[PDB]
Symmetry: D3
Subunit: 230 residues, 6 copies
Amino acid sequence: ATPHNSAQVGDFAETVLMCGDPLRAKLIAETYLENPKLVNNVRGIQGYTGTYKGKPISVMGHGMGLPSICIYAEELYSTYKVKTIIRVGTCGAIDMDIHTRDIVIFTSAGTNSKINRIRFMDHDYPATASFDVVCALVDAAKELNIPAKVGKGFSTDLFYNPQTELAQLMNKFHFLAVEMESAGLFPIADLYGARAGCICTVSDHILHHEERQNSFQNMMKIALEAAIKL
Amino acid sequence: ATPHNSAQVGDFAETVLMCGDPLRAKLIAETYLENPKLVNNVRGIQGYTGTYKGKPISVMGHGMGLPSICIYAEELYSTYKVKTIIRVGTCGAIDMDIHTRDIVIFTSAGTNSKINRIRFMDHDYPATASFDVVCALVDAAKELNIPAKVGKGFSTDLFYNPQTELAQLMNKFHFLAVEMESAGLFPIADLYGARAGCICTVSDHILHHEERQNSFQNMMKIALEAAIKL
Amino acid sequence: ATPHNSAQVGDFAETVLMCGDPLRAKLIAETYLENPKLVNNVRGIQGYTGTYKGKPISVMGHGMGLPSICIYAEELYSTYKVKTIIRVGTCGAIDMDIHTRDIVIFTSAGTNSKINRIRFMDHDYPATASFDVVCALVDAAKELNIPAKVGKGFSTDLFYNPQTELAQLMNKFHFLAVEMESAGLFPIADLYGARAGCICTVSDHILHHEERQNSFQNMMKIALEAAIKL
Amino acid sequence: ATPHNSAQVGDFAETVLMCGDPLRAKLIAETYLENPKLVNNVRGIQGYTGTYKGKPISVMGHGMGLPSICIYAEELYSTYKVKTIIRVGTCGAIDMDIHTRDIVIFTSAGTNSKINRIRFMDHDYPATASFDVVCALVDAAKELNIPAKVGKGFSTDLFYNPQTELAQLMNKFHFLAVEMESAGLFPIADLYGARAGCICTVSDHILHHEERQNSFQNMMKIALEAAIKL
Amino acid sequence: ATPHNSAQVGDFAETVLMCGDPLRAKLIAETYLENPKLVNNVRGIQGYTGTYKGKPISVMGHGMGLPSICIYAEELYSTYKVKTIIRVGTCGAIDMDIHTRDIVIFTSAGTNSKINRIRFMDHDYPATASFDVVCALVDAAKELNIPAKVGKGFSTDLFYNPQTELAQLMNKFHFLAVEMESAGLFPIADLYGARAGCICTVSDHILHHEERQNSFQNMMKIALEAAIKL
Amino acid sequence: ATPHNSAQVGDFAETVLMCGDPLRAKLIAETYLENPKLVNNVRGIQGYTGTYKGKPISVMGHGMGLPSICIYAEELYSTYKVKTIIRVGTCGAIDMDIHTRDIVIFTSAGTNSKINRIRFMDHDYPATASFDVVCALVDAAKELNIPAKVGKGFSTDLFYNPQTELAQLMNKFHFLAVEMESAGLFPIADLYGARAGCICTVSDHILHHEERQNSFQNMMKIALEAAIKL
Ligand SMILES: O=c1[nH]cnc2c1ncn2[C@H]1C[C@H](O)[C@@H](CO)O1
Ligand SMILES: O=c1[nH]cnc2c1ncn2[C@H]1C[C@H](O)[C@@H](CO)O1
Ligand SMILES: O=c1[nH]cnc2c1ncn2[C@H]1C[C@H](O)[C@@H](CO)O1
Ligand SMILES: O=c1[nH]cnc2c1ncn2[C@H]1C[C@H](O)[C@@H](CO)O1
Ligand SMILES: O=c1[nH]cnc2c1ncn2[C@H]1C[C@H](O)[C@@H](CO)O1
Ligand SMILES: O=c1[nH]cnc2c1ncn2[C@H]1C[C@H](O)[C@@H](CO)O1
């Protein structure tokens, strides 16, 4: 159907969970979904569709970086008529009060990318997560009683950031963590009148040096339960 | 104490409601607060402090524009040790599905201002409202059962915007309304580890031409009740 | 007539003096004008119109910041057919050779705002004061024999500026003082084929720590006399 | 060794061919290399190392987008001491004189990304391919007598570009094709005193609508032969 | 003494008139100066020094463009201790009310160059002509009774401007004419605590199609007389 | 024919060598060309046309800076139907491994100018030298067996650069030298479907302090021989 997806309209559920690592998306499909079927593996992206508690749901990788997730997200909403995309994954803590293994739910994401300025006449677009998804993710966290921090995320274009002062500036403004897709995902969902959200498990801290499965599995429970709520 | 506030530390409540119109802040203090006392009138800003349901609360004008509310907000958090600032006021609808008299709760605010780029090393800062305040405002709206739309706001530097195409671009991305302070307020609260939020009543629509008291009074109920919740 | 002015065309004189502080504009109207009449008090802006030496003249507040004065200035030229706007007020000295209580006449104003780049296809717009107004202000200063410094001003969006190095950079380039409106005012006057100028009394120095009525009253004499000359 | 590579220093050859599609890198390793060994499959990236005409050589995917290839390229030069990286892949024709199935060798790449401005104090960095690699690629093309077009490439952050006029602007300036990594790759090689180049087969034209294996296999011959020359 | 000037400190007068055309500077030195001596001809720049009404004065070419005049102006103030530089020359009318052969005195100059943003922390620097020089030029014009228009100039980096809409935008904001140096000259003078100004004769109109010696000679009279006044 | 060229179509050869210094272009015409004829001296630009080894060739100055060479280059390609322009001249070494008297051939040029962003919708245009000209220049260097360094150049708008850190940043990225025109020249050639290149002799090093005729004459041999090859 598309240059990056061999599946046809209907092969994907209206709700898709996406992580950067394709092997992780496969693991997720084999571990949490019932009767998972590979609906798209163009570029080894591992796109699956199965069911969770009887409801249809798809999991697929989205590569690293805004440009990558932008291709997939726009194709999903536009062609496969997906309604909700929840980015699930890892991130790097910024805030001194955030620690490795913590789970973070993004209210929004800042970025050093130029993409949003391009789509928004060179102004400040607030890459905001859909309030419905933020609420579903937080309620799930409350119902499951899993501690989660809610706040600003930062989607960097530079994993290895030359601007070494940025980290501290972000800590001062209390950005929770850093990943590489949210800022791109959120605006695309707005454009298509759809929904997007993000939840991550801190795999490491960037301002200092600091069982990792429990954290990840807990995050998955939240994302999955929130998917059912939506 | 400051160049724009004659009051002393302690004269302001930890929660302050702010609107652009100083005469409106006076009206609010005389109408909803018990035993309101003028604590600051430098520049006729009408800063009052009284009580709502027994709890301390202050209301004060903040002028129009990011530069203005930036002066007041930073002085409040920094010097008067304020903890929560809720901007209450009017705005201009953008989205075709938003109508005059609707009440809007900002999850965040975009802007054509350069302020945030200055504070954030020329990158994209997501001026996001404090999740606590967004939730308090939404719960209040639910408890009072007052219909309210939650979503992106836009803080413009140009009430009379030369870029006439922007309005439609914003409608496409589904920005709810336009005001002139939120984008400045939110980041300052982050810097001080404090909280900020915004709720507005649409006084007019910018994409087409379309009792106004009820809407305003309803918005006030939400803001006041949410203040108690925080 | 407008969202920020209740007055009707003709209520304002062709020459309007504006300061940020509305209470100051009221003081000015009561102190220097004969038979002052409140023609607009929307948002407590204190818009008055009286006469000076028999000629019609109006005084009105303009709030703090480019966004604010932009609303008022554009409405004045456009709707109320005003011809000349002279910003009168206070500012913060930058140049080491400028001292508190000095009077400064802006030839132009630089800015960290994005407004002019928005109106000028992202290029460098030289926010220049109208030569007629600069001359009238300087002749008035010469005729009254009141020492006044003429030169560059700077309109900041950030009263509390994060970029602490800027102050010294500006001293090196010899910017006289800092305020928050001139850069916005001047271009709007150009667009409407009208005139704008600015004169301020240094209320404090930003690079070091350093009767204030005389300075202010002297500035008023210059502005008033210059208004008659125009 | 790194967050995206499980291999150890020495597992990679000093010359690495990279394409976006991981399944393509696997195909390449199985088709053109002798005794290929999987040295890194973190995130299913398919990193192989075998030999071509007796010389060591590695092939690995790099995902789509500058942010992605930036992570891999910097890790390769920095940690695995790689010396030459040749991006091999597909692209979209821009120039009216370029047709589907044509092979293009980039002299350099333009971009709408902000990455290089971040690394280069907000100025214009000319993402240029290493002259050694351009020459090796062109000589290989001449020796094999395979028609190839040499010129400017463009690395976009937006596969689905909102700025629809850009395509024509690029045709006017004669940009050959569009991909999503070169502009990021080239500067990183400069920083590490290493080499980078790019050769692509046009899989489609973006300005109009227009056996594909021959073109791809021919491109591979050029890249492989050029690798031996370096 | 410098890479672009063979003269030594003292060879130049404290006041230097500069035009783009070196042959014009030679003509000026031979026509208006008494006992002109070639003090610098590096790059055929035609730097002369003679006397006007007994006072020392130098004339020298400055090439076309901000980068060019920036080299010369900075060397003059810095090394040759020059105090005043008056750019004399031609320009292209923008404003519909300005006609070919009109004489224009710049109060300031806007620009599409990036130079000033580089020197001014990426903010808006108002390239303003020294008030002393503007006054001297205008008084000279009044005393000689030669009609001259005073206002904004524009220093373009692109004589052949791709942005064809800019011309009309500038007419709307009432920019008088276009040249290629003023915006660069003015800030350099500020930095050195020196003075700079500009006066030009419109050689053509850019918005429509419309003895040229009289205009030029009149401009020279003004510049020369103003030089004596300074 | 043009505002800067008195010559008529046909007076210029299809290949033109340009240097900043007009006196240098004259020297070149008198030293290396047979029967040189002055075809254009507007602004003392010294435009000559003669023959080298029987083939027509022109030499002309282009002033200093992108704005200057942009005027000349565009007029040459557009009006005088020139096909190839080779900038010949001096530059300042950046890279620690480059020494005074070295000859450098630009593959491309970076810049702090805004010109290319203006012509390229505010994106990153890679000012790249025409591959044909780079090859001709390098082959000539090889055939003449004259050591020459090939790589990135940098065209600055500020000979006296305020950003003192830039020099080191450029050394880190291995920019060879600095001049003031290449970045402007290359894109113009692309637009006209013509060719441009650059070769310079390092006249000094900017990072430290370090017969100059031999170097210059050698560079000329390369440029001249390369002209014949094209
Ligand atoms: O610390 C991090 N910085 C940037 N990205 C991170 C970090 N931790 C996890 N990620 C995510 C972003 C990409 O999807 C990938 C980069 O390793 O994994
Ligand atoms: O439509 C609007 N555009 C911009 N600002 C608006 C609009 N409606 C209300 N406001 C707010 C922003 C300022 O505080 C003031 C401008 O009239 O009132
Ligand atoms: O020092 C100053 N910085 C910025 N603005 C100033 C300063 N002094 C006076 N002002 C003016 C600008 C605004 O109108 C208001 C800010 O206090 O008063
Ligand atoms: O036409 C294209 N536009 C952008 N990227 C392209 C095009 N054709 C191939 N590519 C490359 C860039 C990415 O690596 C991926 C996008 O499909 O494949
Ligand atoms: O119309 C014009 N546009 C740009 N520059 C102009 C114009 N008229 C005169 N000039 C000046 C600027 C340069 O010094 C040179 C360009 O021809 O002469
Ligand atoms: O070191 C240099 N910096 C900038 N430009 C240079 C340098 N060396 C030579 N040039 C060239 C650029 C201009 O054409 C002129 C400046 O002196 O000569």
